[PDB]
Write a protein that holds these residues in place. Structure first.
Motif, mmCIF file in Angstrom:
data_model
loop_
_atom_site.group_PDB
_atom_site.id
_atom_site.type_symbol
_atom_site.label_atom_id
_atom_site.label_comp_id
_atom_site.label_asym_id
_atom_site.label_seq_id
_atom_site.Cartn_x
_atom_site.Cartn_y
_atom_site.Cartn_z
ATOM 1 N N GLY A 1 -1.749 -7.156 7.625
ATOM 2 C CA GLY A 1 -1.974 -5.801 7.522
ATOM 3 C C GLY A 1 -3.398 -4.909 7.296
ATOM 4 N N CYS A 2 -3.138 -3.939 6.751
ATOM 5 C CA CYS A 2 -4.310 -2.927 6.851
ATOM 6 C C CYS A 2 -4.494 -2.851 5.739
ATOM 7 C CB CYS A 2 -3.424 -1.481 8.000
ATOM 8 S SG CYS A 2 -5.533 -0.462 7.579
ATOM 9 N N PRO A 3 -5.557 -2.929 4.805
ATOM 10 C CA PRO A 3 -5.825 -2.009 3.372
ATOM 11 C C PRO A 3 -5.038 -1.402 3.316
ATOM 12 C CG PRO A 3 -7.423 -3.230 4.040
ATOM 13 C CD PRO A 3 -6.706 -3.474 5.633
ATOM 14 N N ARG A 4 -4.933 -0.694 1.870
ATOM 15 C CA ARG A 4 -3.936 0.473 1.664
ATOM 16 C C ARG A 4 -4.603 1.408 1.392
ATOM 17 N NH1 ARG A 4 2.245 1.065 0.317
ATOM 18 N NH2 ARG A 4 1.623 2.652 1.282
ATOM 19 N N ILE A 5 -6.375 1.126 1.218
ATOM 20 C CA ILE A 5 -7.333 1.674 0.435
ATOM 21 C C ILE A 5 -7.180 3.449 1.578
ATOM 22 C CG2 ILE A 5 -9.329 2.116 -0.113
ATOM 23 C CD1 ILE A 5 -9.503 -0.584 -0.364
ATOM 24 N N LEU A 6 -7.373 4.588 0.655
ATOM 25 C CA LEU A 6 -7.145 5.563 1.497
ATOM 26 C C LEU A 6 -9.043 5.303 2.321
ATOM 27 C CD1 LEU A 6 -5.252 8.337 0.540
ATOM 28 C CD2 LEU A 6 -4.696 6.129 0.842
ATOM 29 N N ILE A 7 -9.234 5.491 3.482
ATOM 30 C CA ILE A 7 -10.008 5.681 4.313
ATOM 31 C C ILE A 7 -10.463 6.001 5.798
ATOM 32 C CG2 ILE A 7 -11.942 4.206 5.324
ATOM 33 C CD1 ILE A 7 -11.279 2.045 4.302
ATOM 34 N N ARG A 8 -10.878 7.562 5.833
ATOM 35 C CA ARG A 8 -10.830 8.260 6.682
ATOM 36 C C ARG A 8 -11.843 7.581 7.853
ATOM 37 N NH1 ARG A 8 -9.051 13.612 6.298
ATOM 38 N NH2 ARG A 8 -8.812 14.371 3.847
ATOM 39 N N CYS A 9 -11.150 8.393 9.433
ATOM 40 C CA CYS A 9 -11.441 7.620 10.408
ATOM 41 C C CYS A 9 -11.608 8.156 11.533
ATOM 42 C CB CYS A 9 -10.735 6.052 10.711
ATOM 43 S SG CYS A 9 -8.971 6.248 11.192
#
Ligand code: NA
Ligand code: NA
Ligand code: NA
Lengths: 31, 31, 31, 31, 31, 30
Positions: A1-9
């Motif tokens: 799944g997706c890493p849970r680090i907050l990254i805007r996109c």
């Protein structure tokens, strides 16, 4: 799944492996 | 899945979700 | 100390070294 | 440009290369 | 424009914005 | 101290809080 680090996109390719760009404008799992 | 960011580790809990501390002292996917 | 990267979590082991999973579902310092 | 990972900061040097510390205490692109 | 965090990849979409997956299997700046 | 994420650096300001650019060319604890 997706890493849970907050990254805007703005699009899915902005994110790490396993992630899409959610409607909240953050990288998240596609579930 | 473990994120593919290189993170040095001592023990499994040093790592992000889905990862363990591998033989080579980096976080990675189990087995 | 706990690095000041915003990471969501469910349990302490989801977080980087030095961090615990806070009651708000983000990683932070046990202080 | 500054990476779009959410990272708290107190001054610009807390951030990655290309970034400054913005008005809300997170790293961002200058101007 | 690519962040200098070491991230292993198989394809460009594995990388952060501004990056491609180099022949070295790490995220890096394109030409 | 410094996160143990591998970040390449040329100077200390390239690194996160609590970190300096070490002789190995990566951010680390002073
Ligand atoms: Na952990
Ligand atoms: Na910095
Ligand atoms: Na990507």
């Amino acid at each position: 799944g997706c890493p849970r680090i907050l990254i805007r996109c703005k699009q899915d390719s902005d994110c790490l492996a396993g992630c899409v760009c959610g409607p909240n404008g953050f990288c998240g799992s596609p579930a």
